[PDB]
Design a protein around this nucleic acid. Structure first.
Ligand SMILES: [Mg+2]
Ligand SMILES: [Mg+2]
Ligand SMILES: [Mg+2]
Ligand SMILES: [Mg+2]
Ligand SMILES: [Mg+2]
Ligand SMILES: [Mg+2]
Ligand SMILES: [Mg+2]
Ligand SMILES: [Mg+2]
Ligand SMILES: [Zn+2]
Ligand SMILES: [Zn+2]
Lengths: 91, 53, 150, 68, 102, 83, 53, 98, 24
RNA sequence: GUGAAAUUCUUGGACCGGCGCAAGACGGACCAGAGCGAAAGCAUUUGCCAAGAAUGUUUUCAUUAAUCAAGAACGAAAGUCGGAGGUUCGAAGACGAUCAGAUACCGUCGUAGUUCCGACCAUAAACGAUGCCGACCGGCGAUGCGGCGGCGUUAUUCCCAUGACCCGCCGGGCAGCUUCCGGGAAACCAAAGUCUUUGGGUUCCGGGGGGAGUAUGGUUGCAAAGCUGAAACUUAAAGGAAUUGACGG
């Protein structure tokens, strides 16, 4: 059955730290402990090892990423901009 | 120009001066305000294009 | 009026009052059946088969010249598609919209169109399961539908 | 002042307030230009140089305007 | 009572029309509701054309026109007398007043 | 007119009216014989064809599908089928 | 040099108008504006041969 | 238009032609000289891709680098598992022109 | 009053009532 | 800067003119009783991505449909939360004026906000103050899209295609003018007609004015608030459309 109405993963914190802080950390913890689909082997086994470090259990590929998500939106936009500037630089 | 149209202007920035003569080179052109405003009319479409070249 | 659009278009096809095969049509029933079988082996849906037959081979209605409809002929020979054509195309459209949506999260218009498409899919599937064309436990799953089409 | 500094002709560039604000030149344009003409100064080209935004920031006064 | 069939604006098959600022008071007026006047006035007064022509360095100089489009809220349009109240029947005609060429 | 004869319309207004709104539905399309120059065989082509029709003996296009009617390639002869 | 001299009568706009007649007629076709974005180092000989011979 | 065409043709290769799914079976079919087309996901390891290309050159068979990945190639094949390499023995649908 | 300002006055009064009831 | 002023900036060069740099907003004029979208809404170029109405169809399925409690998606602006950004404008606030007073209208400055991304909220005169689907019932000239048919002009080219115009027809739209179709209390409406000659299908919803969209209960929401929602008591009128008169800074 459903065990909690809204706290979900931050039910481990009990009544402590405040509702807004628990709500704030809930999404970050979900993204932190989620298992991502590896873009090298295709298996959903890419998970965080340390802060910013993401490892895949299948192909043993370690990727440097975000603290809580596998990649940040900032880095994705940066990669797109770098690709655009590289293809502009040469002709 | 001796007998060209008058609604066209030129920028002609100065690069070098020798003696009492300032020497200019092309810097840009533009139409006059009245010509541009008179060209735009209703019940018609205008097409605007820009290109770096 | 359209099912999911506020459009009241009238563009249809006016089938002629003459049900007789035209005299210049030399094609016999077996020849048309062979053409349908070949075009089905090429992978054409019955709508495309009818379009090709009308455009190129000069047959007006397959039902008029053979006595049977195209899907009837395919099902009789046993090479009719497992999914109905329009249901297949609706699932294909929904899969395409979902593929576009998982990259463009802000496309709320695409979400609205996806909702409309899935409503159409479920209504068509309910009709087909009532007619027992589909298995009675047939269900459209948005996650696993992508392998069923294309 | 121009005559005592040896200038005999003048190109004219009329300007209004421009920008997001009004585009009609003030009451002084006509009299200033006519006085320049009647003072012996020669007149050359005339052109409007009012700043026209391709589109501007929000004009002051609120959405209900200047209530008077 | 519904005074006008079109509600005093040109919006027919639209939901929203972008607003414009009144040229007199800077009021946010819908673009299809505002009174528009496109004045094409000589850049010099008709009293001063002769003096400018005399003081021109050119012989056949064509004086510039001034192209200004004006937008008014109906408050400023009525107060500035460009538009006037009309009788109930006379409100229904859309033909602009004649130019008075002669 | 209070006494329009709905039973016997003349062919002019019968042809101008919409295909569905006629007294009896009649398609506006037809079938045509198409002669490609340099080829002897004859292809029966729909007047409103939605596909590119090709000669089986020559790699030549006969019609280009458009919004309403397939535009025949130039140099190609065509006639009607039984009105 | 021969860009500036050919935009002096705006032959570019005239051939643009001539080229666009098969799509939709155009009447007031001009190069409304050109601006100078980058310049090559100001070689004095080039400026001199633009002014002189 | 190329991606939708290859997806439709791959769907029609299934249910109508002889194929084989996977790396080991693809190599087996290639060295038996009966694989007429090899399709590779761009997710393929570069060493595996290069080796399969060398095998294809030796056997004179075509290689198509699929514009998806092993998950999407598996979906395009109609399967619920990832396929990274596959070989068509005979299409039955003119994916491979005579 | 203007109906909008009666609405605003009523909203202020409703907030005050909610506060007083919560105080118990 | 204003009706006039004043706060304010100014021999420290303020304002003005010129040349550049930086930033963030904003996409004029073209722009229309024009288009698209379920609405909210949507206007710089170019590319990509899916989507769509209308039209054409001698293509296919063959009743799969219309409206819909519960439920679901979207939902202007303002407001809330987190992160960027903050040019202008500008709630609050400060000051200068006006004034009998002036906590305002006017002016100067200026916070939140207005900008982007992510998450809430679910309200507008969210209007056509006008449910959806279907059928019938006047005329006319236009407009946008698609298709069809025709003198001709034009673009290149040698001709037809194909564009740009001209004249018509068909289908779907935004509308407009006229009408003793008919309706209505009338204003007005070709729908607000086809209604005592009352019945095409269906959904939501009103029962004199206040109290009151209030109290209470329940529920959603971080909050603001949203949804459901009385009663006591009070009142003989409140309202709608039109006419005459009076009055109008
Ligand atoms: Mg006033
Ligand atoms: Mg009134
Ligand atoms: Mg609105
Ligand atoms: Mg908002
Ligand atoms: Mg913030
Ligand atoms: Mg200010
Ligand atoms: Mg009903
Ligand atoms: Mg009551
Ligand atoms: Zn991996
Ligand atoms: Zn105003």
């Amino acid at each position: 059955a459903k065990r909690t109405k809204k706290v979900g993963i931050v039910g481990k914190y009990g009544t402590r730290y405040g509702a807004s802080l628990r709500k704030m950390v809930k999404k970050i913890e979900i993204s932190q402990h989620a298992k991502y689909t590896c873009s090298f082997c295709g298996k959903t086994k890419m998970k965080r090892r340390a802060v910013g470090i993401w490892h895949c259990g299948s192909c043993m590929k370690t990727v440097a990423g975000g603290a809580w998500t596998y990649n940040t939106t900032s880095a994705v936009t940066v990669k797109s901009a770098i690709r655009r500037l590289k293809e502009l630089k040469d002709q | 120009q001796n007998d060209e149209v008058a609604f066209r202007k030129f920028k002609l920035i100065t690069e070098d001066v020798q003696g009492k003569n300032c020497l200019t080179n092309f810097h840009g052109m533009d139409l006059t305000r009245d010509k541009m405003c008179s060209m735009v009319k209703k019940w018609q479409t205008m097409i605007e294009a820009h290109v770096d070249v | 009026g359209r099912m999911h659009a506020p459009g009241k278009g009238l563009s249809q096809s006016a089938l002629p009052y003459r049900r007789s095969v035209p005299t210049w049509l030399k094609l016999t029933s077996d020849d048309v059946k062979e053409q349908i079988y070949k075009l089905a082996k090429k992978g054409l849906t019955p709508s495309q088969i009818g379009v090709i037959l009308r455009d190129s081979h000069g047959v007006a209605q397959v039902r008029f010249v053979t006595g049977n409809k195209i899907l009837r002929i395919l099902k009789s020979k046993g090479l009719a598609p497992d999914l109905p054509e329009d249901l297949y195309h609706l699932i294909k459209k929904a899969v395409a919209v979902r593929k576009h949506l998982e990259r463009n999260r802000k496309d709320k218009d695409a979400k609205f169109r996806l909702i409309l498409i899935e409503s159409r899919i479920h209504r068509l599937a309910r009709y087909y399961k009532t007619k027992r064309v589909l298995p009675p436990n047939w269900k459209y799953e948005s996650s696993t539908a992508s392998a069923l089409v294309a | 002042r121009c005559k005592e500094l040896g200038i005999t002709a003048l190109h004219i560039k009329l300007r209004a307030t421009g920008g997001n604000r009004t585009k009609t030149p003030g009451p002084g344009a006509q009299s200033a230009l006519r006085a320049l003409a009647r003072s012996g100064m020669k007149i050359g080209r005339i052109e409007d140089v009012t700043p026209i935004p391709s589109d501007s920031t929000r004009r002051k006064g609120g959405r209900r305007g200047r209530r008077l | 009572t519904k005074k006008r069939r079109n509600n005093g604006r040109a919006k027919k098959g639209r939901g929203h029309v972008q607003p414009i600022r009144c040229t007199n008071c800077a009021r946010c007026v819908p673009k299809d509701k505002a009174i528009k006047k496109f004045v094409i006035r000589n850049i010099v007064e008709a009293a001063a054309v002769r003096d400018i022509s005399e003081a021109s360095v050119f012989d056949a100089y064509v004086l510039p026109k001034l192209y200004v489009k004006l937008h008014y809220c109906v408050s400023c349009a009525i107060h500035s007398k460009v538009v006037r109240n009309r009788s109930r029947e006379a409100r229904k005609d859309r033909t602009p007043p004649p130019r008075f060429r002669p | 007119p209070l006494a329009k004869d709905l039973l016997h319309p003349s062919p002019e207004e019968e042809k101008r009216k919409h295909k569905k709104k006629r007294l009896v539905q009649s398609p506006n399309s037809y079938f045509m014989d198409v002669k490609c120059p340099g080829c002897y065989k004859i292809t029966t082509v729909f007047s409103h064809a939605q596909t590119v029709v090709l000669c089986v003996g020559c790699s030549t296009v006969l019609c280009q599908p458009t919004g309403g009617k397939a535009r025949l390639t130039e140099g190609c002869s065509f006639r009607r089928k039984q009105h | 040099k021969e860009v500036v001299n050919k935009l002096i009568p705006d032959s570019i706009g005239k051939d643009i108008e001539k080229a666009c007649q098969s799509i939709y007629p155009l009447h007031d076709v001009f190069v409304r504006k050109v601006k100078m974005l980058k310049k090559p180092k100001f070689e004095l000989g080039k400026l001199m041969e633009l002014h002189g011979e | 238009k190329s991606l939708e065409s290859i997806n439709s043709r791959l769907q029609l290769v299934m249910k109508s032609g002889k194929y084989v799914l996977g790396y080991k079976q693809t190599l087996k079919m290639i060295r038996q000289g009966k694989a007429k087309l090899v399709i590779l996901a761009n997710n393929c390891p570069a060493l595996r891709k290069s080796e399969i290309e060398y095998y294809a050159m030796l056997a004179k068979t075509g290689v198509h680098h699929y514009s998806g990945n092993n998950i999407e190639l598996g979906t395009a094949c109609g399967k619920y598992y990832r396929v990274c390499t596959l070989a068509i023995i005979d299409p039955g649908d003119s994916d491979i022109i005579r | 009053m203007r109906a909008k300002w009666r609405k605003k006055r009523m909203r202020r009064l409703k907030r005050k009532r909610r506060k007083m009831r919560q105080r118990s």
